[PDB]
Amino acid sequence: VKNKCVNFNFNGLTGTGVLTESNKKFLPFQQFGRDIADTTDAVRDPQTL
Amino acid sequence: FGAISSVLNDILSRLDPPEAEVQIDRLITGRLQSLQTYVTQQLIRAAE
Amino acid sequence: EVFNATRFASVYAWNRKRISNCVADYSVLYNSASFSTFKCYGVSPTKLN
Ligand SMILES: *[C@@H]1O[C@H](CO)[C@@H](O)[C@H](O)[C@H]1NC(C)=O
């Protein structure tokens, strides 16, 4: 579910926020991304990649 | 700050409250100390 | 094949087996009365699932 504040548990990574389509592109070895302050900012879907 | 991890969610989902309380307390102490330092610096700079 | 096995190696040659690419249900092991000792360090026994 997207565009709604939800609790998410992505492959054991728990949190709360809004999930949305990402313009960023991940190399085919990276699983999640972090900001300049190292705050989690993106996640790769285990079932959709 | 001496805790097992720097993420509160990991500590919460990995440990029971009686044993996670110590780690949460260490994180609270560290973050409170950092916030007080920031507030004091801001007060001095605001006076200037 | 590890818990319910017939041969257990010697203590100084303890047998290590790697577990990956599967789904593990620790609740059935923890709730079973067959084990007389079940203690976890760095994680609680009810949160492995
Ligand atoms: C199963 O995994 C494959 C490979 O990632 C994926 O393409 C497919 O959509 C998955 N199927 C289901 C039902 O999730």
- CA torsion B4-A5-A45-B8 (nearest 10°) is 0
Q: How many CB atoms lie within 10 A of CB B11?
A: 20
On chain C, the residues whose CB falls within 8 A of the CB of B4 are: 42
**Alpha carbon distance A39, A44 (integer Å):** 15
Q: Method of determination? A: cryo-EM
CB-CB under 8 Å, B15 with C47: yes
How far apart (Å, rounded) are the C-alpha atoms in residues A19 and B10?
20
Q: Is B8 on the interface with C (CB under 8 A)?
A: no
Query: Mind telling me how many Å the CA of B17 is from chain C's nearest CA?
Result: 9
Instruction: Calculate the alpha carbon distances from A6 to A2, A19, A20, A32, A39 in Å.
Output: 9, 8, 11, 18, 18
Q: Are B44 and B15 in contact (CB under 8 A)?
A: no
Residues on chain C touching B14 (C-beta within 8 angstroms): 42-44, 47
Which residue of chain A has the CA closest to B13? A14
